[PDB]
């Protein structure tokens, strides 16, 4: 497989967004992975509505700003037969009534694939598919304060993840890393991204709950 | 400047409101611009009271449901030393007695700036300041009935503006202003309209733009 991948250079990834004061990480993770797969299919990069997911995906098991799962979000888009653009259904960092309108649907999906709980499998998927939704353990001060280099936190869990993010690539320092897009704004980390330790015992659980939508 | 800006995703903009059967557009535009500048200053997004402006800004020149201007509303907030929250001083779509109460003030301003009367200066303000109050010519059936794409009306005028609204951003699909209206969420695109940008100061969008200084 390639030793390095960065889907950002290839047009698959929208700018970093900001969840604000709302536990909607899972919705940002899901929209990032679907943005990637819709670009793969159509050649158009269009920002998708996390608000739509937050407001409408309760039946599939999601709890809005109180948490949720990317796979539940992918199931919603399939069940719903669409997902609105960001520009039509803007993010408000709270839960509102479902206002889905098919008029402004710009994405869809046909299911999802859960990747085997192996960093090797995740690497293959990143190389072959595009950006991939992943859960990490993000609940450490070292992660708030991350600015540069490869992130490693000896107290990270490989089993107890709490944060949904998007792997957009991987590589190495000229000491391997995953390239991860967060949803804490561009001021956090390296332009909103973090290089997380790769092939270091599934560090922070990055390969434990990885998935992507089919389109 | 960036080629695209949308302050809604950055926490500067409240949900779309509905003026109902009252010519209070100017008050919704003003509260929008002040909600954005108060967010810029404090990091808190709090919906402000249009009714407080409708009821109380007569001395600064406004005429309640019979019309008004955003700058007169910004002058009121300055003169008054405050503006009540929406939740404290709810909207009734009619003019009442002034019930302003400082206990519930959650906004202030120190003044206000008028933007140079060019779309280039408007673009610079939107990119650097936040949501901007603007006046447009909305009195065309096309606008009345917009749903998607970029709005362009040949019979639109650049000096006969009659409607106050809020520019929250701009971009391209062929450029547009992203404009928050106050006709509820069922109108337009969730309550918004993409208005032609850099096409003959279309509908007079850069003719009377301003924002409060906080
Ligand atoms: C990230 O914004 C979010 C933060 C938590 C929400 C409430 N407090 C938090 O710290 N994390 C999540 O939403 C995680 C993401 C996964 C991928 C690890 N999922 C959940 O917390 C969660 C809650 C919940 C309740 C019912 C069903 C599923 C479910 N998932
Ligand atoms: C939008 O709600 C409002 C609609 C008019 C008022 C009643 N009839 C209408 O159609 N439009 C306004 O309030 C406009 C907005 C500006 C920014 C163009 N302003 C006026 O009509 C206006 C300003 C003003 C100042 C003093 C006295 C009267 C007066 N009217």
From Swiss-Prot, chain A:
Binding site for Zn(2+) 4: 92, 96
Name of this protein: Cathepsin L
Catalytic residues identified in the record: 25, 163, 182
Positions contributing to Zn(2+) 6 binding: 160
Residues that bind Zn(2+) 3: 71, 114
Sequence positions that bind Zn(2+) 7: 162
Binding positions (Zn(2+) 1): 9
Effect on the protein upon substituting residue 25 to S: Catalytically inactive. Unable to autocleave procathepsin L
Residues where Zn(2+) 5 binds: 137, 140
Origin superkingdom: Eukaryota
Cysteines engaged in disulfide bonds, as pairs: 22-65, 56-98, 156-204
Residues the record lists as binding Zn(2+) 2: 50, 86
Positions glycosylated per UniProt: 108
């Amino acid at each position: 497989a390639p030793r390095s991948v960065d889907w950002r250079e290839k047009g698959y990834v929208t700018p970093v967004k900001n969840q604000g004061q709302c536990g909607s990480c899972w919705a940002f993770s899901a929209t990032g992975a679907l943005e990637g797969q819709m670009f793969r299919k159509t050649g158009r990069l269009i920002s998708l509505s996390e608000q739509n997911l937050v407001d409408c995906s309760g039946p599939q098991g999601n709890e809005g700003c109180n948490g949720g799962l990317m796979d539940y979000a992918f199931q919603y888009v399939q069940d719903n037969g669409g997902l609105d653009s960001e520009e039509s259904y803007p993010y408000e960092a709270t839960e509102e009534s479902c206002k889905y309108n098919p008029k402004y649907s710009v994405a869809n999906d046909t299911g999802f694939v859960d990747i085997p709980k192996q960093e090797k499998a995740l690497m293959k998927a990143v190389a072959t598919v595009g950006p991939i939704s992943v859960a990490i353990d993000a609940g450490h001060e070292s992660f708030l304060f991350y600015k540069e280099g490869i992130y490693f936190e000896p107290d990270c869990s490989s089993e107890d993840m709490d944060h949904g993010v998007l792997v957009v690539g991987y590589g190495f320092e000229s000491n391997k890393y995953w390239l991860v897009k967060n949803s804490w704004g561009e001021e956090w980390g390296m332009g909103g991204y973090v290089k997380m330790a790769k092939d270091r015992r599934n560090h922070c659980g990055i390969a434990s709950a990885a998935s992507y939508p089919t389109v």
